[PDB]
Amino acid sequence: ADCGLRPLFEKKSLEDKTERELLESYI
Amino acid sequence: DFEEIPEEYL
Amino acid sequence: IVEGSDAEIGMSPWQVMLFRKSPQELLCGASLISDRWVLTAAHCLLYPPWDKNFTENDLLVRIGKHSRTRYERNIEKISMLEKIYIHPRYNWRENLDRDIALMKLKKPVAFSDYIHPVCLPDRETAASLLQAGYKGRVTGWGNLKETGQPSVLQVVNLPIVERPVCKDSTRIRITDNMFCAGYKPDEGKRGDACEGDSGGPFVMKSPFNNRWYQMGIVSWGEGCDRDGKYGFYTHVFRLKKWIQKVIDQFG
Ligand SMILES: N[C@H](Cc1ccccc1)C(=O)N1CCC[C@H]1C(=O)NCc1cccnc1
Ligand SMILES: *[C@@H]1O[C@H](CO)[C@@H](O)[C@H](O)[C@H]1NC(C)=O
Ligand code: NA
Ligand code: NA
Numbered sequence: 675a676d677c678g679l680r681p682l683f684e685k686k687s688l689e690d691k692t693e694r695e696l697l698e699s700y701i
Numbered sequence: 702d703f704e705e706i707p708e709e710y711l
Numbered sequence: 712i713v714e715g716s717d718a719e720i721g722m723s724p725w726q727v728m729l730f731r732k733s734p735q736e737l738l739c740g741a742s743l744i745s746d747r748w749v750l751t752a753a754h755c756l757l758y759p760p761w762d763k764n765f766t767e768n769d770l771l772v773r774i775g776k777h778s779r780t781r782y783e784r785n786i787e788k789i790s791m792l793e794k795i796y797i798h799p800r801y802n803w804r805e806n807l808d809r810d811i812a813l814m815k816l817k818k819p820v821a822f823s824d825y826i827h828p829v830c831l832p833d834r835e836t837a838a839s840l841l842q843a844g845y846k847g848r849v850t851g852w853g854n855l856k857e858t859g860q861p862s863v864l865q866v867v868n869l870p871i872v873e874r875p876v877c878k879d880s881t882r883i884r885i886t887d888n889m890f891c892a893g894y895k896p897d898e899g900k901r902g903d904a905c906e907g908d909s910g911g912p913f914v915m916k917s918p919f920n921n922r923w924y925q926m927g928i929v930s931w932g933e934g935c936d937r938d939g940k941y942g943f944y945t946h947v948f949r950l951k952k953w954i955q956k957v958i959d960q961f962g
């Protein structure tokens with residue numbers, strides 16, 4: 675339901691310091 | 702090397 | 712984890728530590744997939760060449776951790792095992808094919824800022840994300856070098872590698888129940904799982920719904936972070952029908 679949404683990140687719309695590296699690889 | 706854990710868990 | 716970095720607080724709240732009761736030591740990584748179920752590698756529990764065959768009462772699960780060795784009072788939660796389930800066709804004799812196991816907890820764990828489950832992929836997210844070049848994230852408290860141990864959870868992002876390059880990097884027979892990840896020698900960047908990271912998750916953040924999915928399980932490698940070698944991961948989606956069967960059968 676809520677799987678995969680981290681309380682300290684996605685749930686508060688904060689990004690961790692390297693998730694963008696993953697996104698940029700999803701080309 | 703590990704801090705001991707509460708006895709309850711063992 | 713070799714050539715990774717310290718995790719942020721709460722960055723991997725599905726991370727689980729498999730802990731030996733006596734002597735008290737790290738055994739493996741693992742992941743939280745619901746309030747009662749933990750996913751790991753079968754070789755974390757059963758590996759006869761090394762005389763490893765653990766039973767439920769030999770083990771604990773430590774959830775919500777950050778520090779490797781300290782007891783993280785009011786943050787981590789420690790749970791006992793009700794039952795272990797190993798894939799019935801796990802191949803410990805040859806190549807660790809179908810290297811997957813489930814652990815059911817005696818009691819449900821309370822979710823918190825530090826404890827939260829990861830999603831398992833459906834067919835479509837797997838097909839969309841399990842592509843050469845796409846990066847996932849591996850986490851663990853295993854060795855920092857092939858030949859020491861971290862103070863806190865380590866993280867590294869690694870690209871999935873083309874299957875022919877995986878195959879050509881090793882003499883072990885690879886199967887469709889595996890994928891490999893890591894940089895090539897010509898790529899400049901490096902990183903790998905290592906001893907002690909076994910059983911931990913390889914995760915990807917879907918760009919479609921911004922949720923984290925566990926696509927792999929740390930399974931095997933020949934050395935750690937060696938040039939021209941790659942880490943091998945259990946293909947979670949390929950084994951999901953087994954996962955579901957177990958959870959549907961046993962609660
Ligand atoms: N080094 C072996 C290679 C192997 C032996 C027999 C079958 C398949 C692969 C290995 O990775 N093993 C032997 C059995 C457990 C597993 C391991 O240590 N996995 C954790 C690991 C080790 C090194 C790098 N990344 C992850
Ligand atoms: C592992 O141990 C279980 C229980 O001790 C046993 O049934 C099995 O024979 C052992 N060896 C395996 C599972 O290959
Ligand atoms: Na080969
Ligand atoms: Na390598």
